[PDB]
Amino acid sequence: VNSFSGYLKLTDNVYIKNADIVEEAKKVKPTVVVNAANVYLKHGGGVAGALNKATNNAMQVESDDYIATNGPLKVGGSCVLSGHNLAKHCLHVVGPNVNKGEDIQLLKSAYENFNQHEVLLAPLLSAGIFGADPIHSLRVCVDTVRTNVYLAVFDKNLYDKLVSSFL
Numbered sequence: 001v002n003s004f005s006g007y008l009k010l011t012d013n014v015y016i017k018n019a020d021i022v023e024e025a026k027k028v029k030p031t032v033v034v035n036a037a038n039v040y041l042k043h044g045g046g047v048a049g050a051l052n053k054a055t056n057n058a059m060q061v062e063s064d065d066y067i068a069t070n071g072p073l074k075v076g077g078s079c080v081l082s083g084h085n086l087a088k089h090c091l092h093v094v095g096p097n098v099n100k101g102e103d104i105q106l107l108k109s110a111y112e113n114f115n116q117h118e119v120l121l122a123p124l125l126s127a128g129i130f131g132a133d134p135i136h137s138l139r140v141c142v143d144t145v146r147t148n149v150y151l152a153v154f155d156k157n158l159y160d161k162l163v164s165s166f167l
């Protein structure tokens with residue numbers, strides 16, 4: 001039993017809800033919140049910009065030190081950093097950004113990072129401003145993640161479409 005509430009259950013392990021991920025994490029304080037990151041950990045917009053704003057830019061300051069030490073992530077890769085005031089940890093995961101010409105096949109690799117964590121709050125990878133088809137991202141999530149994932153969907157019209165179209 002966990003404290004996630006109001007989710008629709010899609011499979012044995014994937015749950016979904018219409019929610020603002022910033023407000024969800026603040027309420028639940030999950031062990032792991034997933035950020036929709038880029039390889040530079042520059043948290044400018046979309047989920048990333050919103051999560052960073054909620055930390056009063058502490059996420060960005062931590063991220064800049066991480067990059068200065070380690071260099072950029074790989075597309076499809078991840079790193080674990082602090083969750084600041086939102087969660088114990090933030091798993092920064094880089095899904096392909098179609099608006100940059102990145103290979104959509106890397107979306108499965110990106111979701112594989114979730115399997116290193118028993119329970120996660122997360123957005124749909126490569127959705128929103130990353131330019132991929134969200135119905136596709138949900139399908140890859142369900143077919144790749146085996147741990148317990150609670151998916152927050154910002155857009156109301158999008159959430160209803162994912163549920164109604166889910167197989």
Ligand SMILES: OC[C@H](C[C@H]1CCCO1)Nc1ncnc2[nH]ccc12
Nearest residue numbers: 021046047050123124127128154155
């Ligand atoms: O796939 C990531 C989605 C994409 C959106 C853009 C259009 C339809 O869905 N973004 C977010 N999902 C959940 N919480 C969020 N908080 C801030 C942004 C955000």
Ligand SMILES: [Cl-]
Nearest residue numbers: 046047128129
């Ligand atoms: Cl977005």
